[PDB]
Amino acid sequence: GNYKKPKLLYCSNGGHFLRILPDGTVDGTRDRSDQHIQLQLSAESVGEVYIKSTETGQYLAMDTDGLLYGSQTPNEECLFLERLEENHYNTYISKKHAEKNWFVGLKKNGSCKRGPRTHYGQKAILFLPLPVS
């Protein structure tokens, strides 16, 4: 609702909520009561955002391998281009790896789907911004 308020990023695939774990691991879950799925989004520029846990204050990031981890301090690997596609879902592409067209995604089981194996036609890249409750 209010861009300043926390939200949960719901994947259209397994219907998972994106989750950043203290150990810096990011996977998925249906546990809508978890405390590591609450995300706060901030824009560095028009259409360019940061995503982070309002519990571990970690920033969602993606390394040169395509892995999504929880970084304690923001940086390039922490920026994503937020887009509201025409099907009305949100896609997030690595700012740093924009060219390799790596998207943020989760497998059906609910695990990171390394950017490289991600494709625009895919369904793991599609997220729906949801309210905490």
Binding site: N2, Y3, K4, Y10, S12, G14, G15, R30, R32, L41, S42, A43, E44, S45, V46, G47, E48, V49, Y50, P74, E82, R83, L84, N87, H88, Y89, N90, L128, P129, L130
Partner: protein, 213 residues
């Protein structure tokens, strides 16, 4: 005629995705594949009560061959819990899906009416400016000052001269940008202050004037 068997799930896996959040107008399908002898029947509930096709515009499609229900063009009033009941003389099983229908705002930021309000104040006083924004895709806010370089306030492209005063970036906070605070306001600090809110779709802006005296 055959040894009785209470209804059971033929495909549990395909049932774990309990919460179905989908953008408005999409098509939703819930499936509860089961079996048993005698062969079980199937019916659906919505938020507790019986769910007949007369309960939503255009009704819905049930394909028993696949123990599924299908609703085309989801709308907000479709939000709720969907429970399938499989029953035969020897038992009953059920599963409940939660359907959430999300509405998107594929538009530029909407700025709150009024803010930032125009002003004419007294020197040395600290003046604020509030800008409140509604935006689905994350917005970015920036405050600008209507410059008057040379004599013209309108630049060479018919676009008013400006100077960026405050920009949102990691830090600040969604709420720190929401306000432009001035210090010991002077005379030259006279003019129009503009708040620019832009998202991946477009930009919106509100102005307010401030005269010095």
């Amino acid at each position: 005629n055959r040894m009785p068997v209470a209804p059971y799930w033929t495909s549990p896996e395909k049932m774990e995705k309990k919460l179905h959040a989908v953008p408005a107008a999409k098509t939703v399908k819930f499936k509860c594949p089961s079996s048993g002898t005698p062969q079980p029947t199937l019916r659906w509930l919505k938020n507790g009560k019986e769910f007949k096709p007369d309960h939503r515009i255009g009704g819905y499609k049930v394909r028993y061959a696949t123990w599924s229900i299908i609703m085309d063009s989801v709308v907000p009033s479709d939000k709720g819990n969907y429970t399938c009941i499989v029953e035969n003389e020897y038992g009953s099983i059920n599963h409940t899906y939660q359907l959430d229908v999300v509405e998107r705002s594929p538009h530029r930021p909407i700025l709150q009416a009024g803010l930032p309000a125009n002003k004419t104040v007294a020197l040395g006083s600290n003046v604020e400016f509030m800008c409140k924004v509604y935006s689905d895709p994350q917005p970015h806010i920036q405050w600008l000052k209507h410059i008057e370089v040379n004599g013209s306030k309108i630049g060479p492209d018919n676009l008013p001269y400006v100077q960026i005063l405050k920009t949102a970036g990691v830090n600040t906070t969604d709420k720190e940008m929401e306000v432009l605070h001035l210090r010991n306001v002077s005379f030259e600090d006279a003019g129009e202050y503009t708040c620019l809110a832009g998202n991946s779709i477009g930009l919106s802006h509100h102005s307010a004037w401030l005269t010095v005296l």
